[PDB]
Structures are given as C-alpha cells and as structure tokens.
Ligand binder design. Structure first.
Ligand SMILES: NC(=O)N[C@@H](CC(=O)O)C(=O)O
Ligand SMILES: NC(=O)N[C@@H](CC(=O)O)C(=O)O
Ligand SMILES: [Zn+2]
Ligand SMILES: [Zn+2]
Ligand SMILES: [Zn+2]
Ligand SMILES: [Zn+2]
Ligand SMILES: [Zn+2]
Ligand SMILES: [Zn+2]
Lengths: 363, 363
C-alpha cells in the first residue's frame, strides 16, 4: 500500500549551471530531485557567472527552462555592488540570497551596512534568505528589525542558532528557518568515517548535542531543505575540498525513516516539505502533481545515488525505511522506480505562472 | 591663562593588577590617569585571576583601595559559568563586561545563548558593556532587544560599526558607545611606522575612511575612553605580541589638539569625558575636584610617557597642543607638571559612596 503525498518543495538547492556543470546541471539535479520525491526546487545563485544581475538571471532562466525536469524558481544573490539595482527583476526570482559567512561562494558582503542596504532596497514583499551562522543569525535578525521586515534563515545547524530563533519567535519577530538533513542525521561522530575532505560542509557538522537540540526544537523549524551542494569525489578528496553535500536523493528517505520511528509525524514532514515552503516563498500549487511512497521498504544507502553528478554521498551505509515509487508532475509520469520519464526542459519557472507571482500592494 | 575642567572620567582602562603587574599596576596606572587629567577610572576585569566571581572582586577591591591614586570602579566580567551568580555583588561593580570577540582575554563566550543568559540574569538597572566588533555589534544589539534593555558598545573603530549604531539610535534603541583615541588619530597609514607587533590592537587600526567616518559621526559617539591596555615593549615586539596600546597619558592632549583645530568643541569633549560617562554608568560627582590645562603649549609625544609601565607609545612623534598642568582631587593637589603628589591608596571605590550606588526600584 503506497501513500500519496503532495508535490514536495526544496527551497535550497545548488544546481551548478551555469559554470560548474561537471558537478551537476539542471537536467541531472532535477532528475535527482524527482527521484527524491521533490517536484519544485529553488536554485541558489552562487553559479559561474553568479546570478547577481539581470543578464545573468536571463541566462540562468533559459538554461533552466531548457534543462529542468521539475519546476523551479531561481534566487538572485546579493553582492557588494547590486543593492538598488534589482528592482525590475526582483519579482521574477525566488527571493534574494545573502551570503553572510565563509562558504562556497562576487558573494560575501564586507559590512553590515551592505546588509542594511539590501534590506532597504529589495522590495519589502519579496523573500530574503540568509546564510547566517552562529552570531550572524542574531546580527541579521537585528538588521531585519531595523528595516522592519522578515528574514528566513538557511540551514540552521546548531543548538545556539535554533534557541536564538526560538527566542525571537517568542518575541513575535518575523523570522522563519529551515534545517538540512545532514544536520539532523549526521554529527561529529561521523567525521572519522567521512574523513576531513568529504566531511567539509557549511555550516559544519554539529555535536550530538546540536543534533539533539534540533530534534527537541522541531516546533521551531519551519522547513526542511536539502542544501543540495554537489561536488565531485575528486574535489571533495583533493587538496582544497569545497564544502557541501549532495542531498536531494537522500532527504526524503532519511525523513521517512524518522517518521516510521515516530520521531516526527507525517504531517510534521508535510508542513516542512510542502505547506511552509509554499507560504514563506509564495510558491504556487502544481496541478495534477503527487508523489507515491512505499513506507515499508528497507534499504541501505549506497556509495552513490543514481542521478546526482556528485557521484558520492555522506549518508553511505545508513539504513533507511521508505522509498519513492512514483512521481506525477502536472499530469505526466515523471519518475518510476529508478527511471526518470520526463525530459530535460519539461520543468517550468513557477514565477512566470499567473498564480506564482508574489502579491503586492499597487506601487 | 589656564582652563579649568571638571574631573574627567575614563570608563575603559586595563590596570593589570592582579597578575600582570610588570605591565602596569593600580599605582602606576592611576598615576598615568592623573597625568592625563583623569580623576576616575573604570577598570576592566581581564586580570589574573579575572574578576569573574565574588572572591576575585574582593581581592581586586583591596588591591585597588591600597594602590589607586585616583578614584575608581571595577568591572565584573561575564564568563561561561557565572551567569546567575553575580547578583549579590553586581551593584558594587562598575558594570558587567562581555568579551564577544578574540582579544587579550576564562573570557570569550561560546554561544549567543550565553550572552542572552547574562542579559537575563544581570540586574536590569546595572550597566552592561561589550567588546563587540563588526557584525558582533548587530548581534549584541539583537540580544539587548530580546531582553528589553540597554547596552554600551566599547571602542567603536569602524565606519560599519558607527553607522550601525547610528541606525539603531534613529530607531530609538537604547544603545550608547565610546571611541578610543587611537581610532581617531591613527590608521592603516601608521602601520609601516609602528610595525606589526606594536601595531597590534583590538579592534585593529582602521582605514582613513574608518577614521573619517568616526569624526563625521561625532554626534553618535557618547564617550571617549582610552582602552588603556599596557604591555611592555618586549611583549609588543616579541614573537606573540599581545594587542593593546597604553593611552591614559596621551588621550587628553590628543583631544585638546583637536579642539584647538576646531575639529570638536570644548563642550563636545566634556560631554564625552565627563557628563556622558557619569550618566551612562551612574558615577558620582567628585567634590572639590578639577583639572587645569594649558591649551597653548606645543609639544611632541616622546617614545614613552613618564608613568605607564608600558614604557612605549604608538603616538610617538605626533605634535600636540595642550597639556595638563594641575589636578586637584577631593581637595588635595594630585598632580602638578609631571609630579604626582598623592600616594598609592589615596583613591577610593566610588561604588561605596552613598551617592555612587545605582538607583533601583525596591526589589
Ligand atoms: N553548504 C555548503 O557547504 N556549500 C554550499 C554553499 C552554502 O549553502 O553555503 C555550496 O554551494 O556548495
Ligand atoms: N584592546 C586591546 O587590544 N587589548 C585589551 C583588551 C580589549 O580591550 O579588548 C587589553 O586588555 O590588552
Ligand atoms: Zn549556505
Ligand atoms: Zn536556504
Ligand atoms: Zn546552499
Ligand atoms: Zn575590548
Ligand atoms: Zn569600554
Ligand atoms: Zn579593553
């Protein structure tokens, strides 16, 4: 007996096109998404060229329309030069991404004043998300309050961060957050197995206490999102390993395993992979779209999943229970038991759908 | 013709006793204060042992009462273990000091949650000051708002920081700040002369643009305070130079030079070295206390000032105009033209004076 889920949404993926297509491209990354039960993805802007201006966004839109197999929206990235210049294209993006700490990214800002300038100039009704670790979470929350608007915190990984966000929510501040599966299912305990190259990720893997705190504070977590961050094994194991884990193909099975163990409910999962992503980012429904999962199937994660060009996974060897059997996207069979059945280009930019525009007051 | 000033107050000094008395002690550091026209100092807690508990405070109080030549108050320091334990002695301290960044200090905290715990437990009517650089300023401001109280930012050094504080004040937030003379009168341009050891300080010396921004935003600066941070020349020039500059003997002459050039007024100076320190820290008046300065005397700062045991200065070679001629402290001549005339032990703990307690609602 299969369970029918709505089309799941991952608001944090790196699809590497343009410019990093040996790691992933729209076609391979959206194949990975579909195999993971994900029918809509929001792609981050730290590509080459980075998506920090109208011409880069135009290029990325065309590459995505030609290559994506599932539906998508594309983030714009904040830079040290583009505040006040994105107004005409802002509404066509998923939102604006701020990179506020060292990581795989034309996009660290030099000064909190630059953060302020982005919060002041980006349209107030459109999403802002931030890579903001440890005290940076508190700092960007302060900027959001000074500018009287909301912010969404990406990949929360630490007890410190989730408790800060919890305190902010208790004060009624408009903040939401997401958590990635590696910060729920891996910890320092796994670094010996992974090694120092494979284990590189930002935010870094946390202690057992960090992981426990995220689970204990599940009520504070608005979304799950993979931070799918593919790099090749050669890159991960080489002399300057880039941070990041692939995760689209493993996220849902890991979380289904947790559901079957009673660690969270099916509803908790659907709030975090469907309803809350929709409402935070004003993402539209997908007609005739659903995912069928088998909750009984036990398997062990292999050394690589079938679709991502990363061709490795940090979850190798973990025992999971639950698998994606079928995905239907807008009335077409998109995935069945290991086979993707929609071509590159089937996917569409949801921000171009009438129902996918973010509502705003007449300007 | 001399000008009579009130007794000036420096709310940020490191007097190194207990435990670092080769660098400075209460007797030498307060001699330096008097020679700089300062009659009251607030001493930081990063000593050895650090002033982070009642027994350490009791020791420091006695050492100060025996050694100080001018009046004083002693800060307590926040640690990772003492939140919720300082309530009985809190009112006897200048305030609570938080070290939130790497510097010469049992006292960096590991987590913003620890900052929150201090803001929640330290009595709400008593001062909190923070070493908080760059985004850390925004982060600690957020914690202050979450806990509904004020904060004072130590040694603001950058355009980024002063503009953030300016924005916070424009939103009516209860934040005050101080600036140290090296961040007004030295910059990157001086690093070649100073060298990499002598030039080490936290916050580091800023660009010309940082310095210009502090001057342009003088209205945002509530206090001047030296961050007198004496270390010996051997230490500054050795293989692991500690950060910090001595500054008590040079602060007032540097600022008087600026007054005579019309860069700020005498009133601006007195707000920042007398009235605002009094009101932010609830420091009492000193009866029969004043400083006489000669605004016409031109001199060049030598390679060391007479009193600080640091026996070096980063301001060597700077031309100044203005000198302290006489200091009277509580009816006794304390300093005349290079000679200190009150003994170690003349100084008193102002928090023990009836008028020096911080007012509070009956608990
Ligand atoms: N998380 C990572 O370790 N890397 C991400 C960047 C990011 O999400 O910060 C990537 O794009 O590779
Ligand atoms: N400012 C410094 O560079 N050093 C100070 C510590 C401090 O004020 O942060 C010291 O105590 O030496
Ligand atoms: Zn990130
Ligand atoms: Zn994110
Ligand atoms: Zn990312
Ligand atoms: Zn400091
Ligand atoms: Zn200070
Ligand atoms: Zn200091």
């Amino acid at each position: 007996k299969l369970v029918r889920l709505p089309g799941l949404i991952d608001v944090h993926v790196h699809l590497r096109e343009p410019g990093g297509t040996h790691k992933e491209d729209f076609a391979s990354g959206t194949a990975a998404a579909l195999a993971g039960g994900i029918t809509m993805v929001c792609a981050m802007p730290n590509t080459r060229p980075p998506i920090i201006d109208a011409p880069a966004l135009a290029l990325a839109q065309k590459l995505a329309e030609a290559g994506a197999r599932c539906d998508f929206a594309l983030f714009l990235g904040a830079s040290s030069e583009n505040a006040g210049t994105l107004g005409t294209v802002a509404g066509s993006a998923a939102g604006l991404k701020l990179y506020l700490n060292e990581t795989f990214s034309e996009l660290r800002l030099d000064s909190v004043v630059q953060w302020m300038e982005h919060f002041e100039t980006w349209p107030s009704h459109l999403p802002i998300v931030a890579h903001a670790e440890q005290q940076t979470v508190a700092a960007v929350l302060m900027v959001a309050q000074l500018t009287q608007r909301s912010v969404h915190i990406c990949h929360v990984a630490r007890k410190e961060e989730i408790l800060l966000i919890k305190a902010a929510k208790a004060r009624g501040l408009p903040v939401t957050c997401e958590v990635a599966p590696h910060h729920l299912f891996l910890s320092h305990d796994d670094l010996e197995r992974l090694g120092p190259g494979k284990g590189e990720v930002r935010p870094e893997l946390g202690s057992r206490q960090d992981v426990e705190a995220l689970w204990e504070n599940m009520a504070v977590i608005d979304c799950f999102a993979s931070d799918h961050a593919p790099h090749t094994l050669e890159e991960k194991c080489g002399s300057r390993p880039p941070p990041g884990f692939p995760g689209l193909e493993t996220m849902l099975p890991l979380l289904l395993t947790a559901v079957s163990e009673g660690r969270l409910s099916l509803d908790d999962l659907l709030q975090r992979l469907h309803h809350n992503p929709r409402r935070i980012f004003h993402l539209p429904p997908q007609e005739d779209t659903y995912v069928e999962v088998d909750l009984e199937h036990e398997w062990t994660i292999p050394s690589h999943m079938p679709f991502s060009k990363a061709h490795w996974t940090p979850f190798e060897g973990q025992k999971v229970k639950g698998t994606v059997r079928r995905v239907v996207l807008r009335g077409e069979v998109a995935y069945i038991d290991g086979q993707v059945l929609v071509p590159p280009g089937y996917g569409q930019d949801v921000r171009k759908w009438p129902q996918g525009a973010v509502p705003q007051l007449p300007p």
